[PDB]
């Protein structure tokens, strides 16, 4: 079955892959759906901004990506206590609260 000088191949096609084929023919469909979802959110919900809760300045845990920066998840309850406001009052102001993040 093999031939002249070429790379040894091990394709993972022995399993019946013909049944489970997912091809993005609805990719502009999802694009239009999610545009309408964002616009309907900005209509119906509030004059709150899009991507409503504010995300923290957060460093990435690695020896690789720790030179860069990232929008995190929440404001790390010790930090919120130093800022001096209540938890759910902060959640209604717009502060994203994650109780797991340490300092």
């Amino acid at each position: 079955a093999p031939s002249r000088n070429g790379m040894v191949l091990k394709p993972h096609f022995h399993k019946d892959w013909q049944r489970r084929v997912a091809t993005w023919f609805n990719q502009p469909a999802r694009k239009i759906r999610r545009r309408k979802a964002r616009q309907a959110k900005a209509r119906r919900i509030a004059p709150r901004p899009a991507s409503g809760p504010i995300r923290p300045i957060v460093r990435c845990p690695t020896v690789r990506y720790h030179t860069k920066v990232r929008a995190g998840r929440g404001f790390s309850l010790e930090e919120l206590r130093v800022a001096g406001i209540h938890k759910k009052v902060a959640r209604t102001i717009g502060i994203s609260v994650d109780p797991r993040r340490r300092n």
């Binding site: 504010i54 995300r55 923290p56 300045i57 860069k68 920066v69 929008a71």
Partner: protein, 51 residues
């Protein structure tokens, strides 16, 4: 929310013997010290044991 902070430190004069002390051998000495930290402590404990 990105705010990639950019420290520059553009102007400084060439300085004293840090350029004569911060050579390649410091990394190898630190690597050897980190690899042989505990065995020296075991030899110190054995030197204290053998009186």
């Amino acid at each position: 929310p990105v705010r990639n902070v950019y420290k520059k430190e553009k102007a400084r004069v060439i300085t004293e013997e840090e350029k004569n002390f911060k050579a390649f051998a410091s990394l190898r000495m630190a690597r050897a010290n980190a690899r042989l930290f505990g065995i020296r402590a075991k030899r110190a404990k054995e030197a204290a044991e053998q009186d």
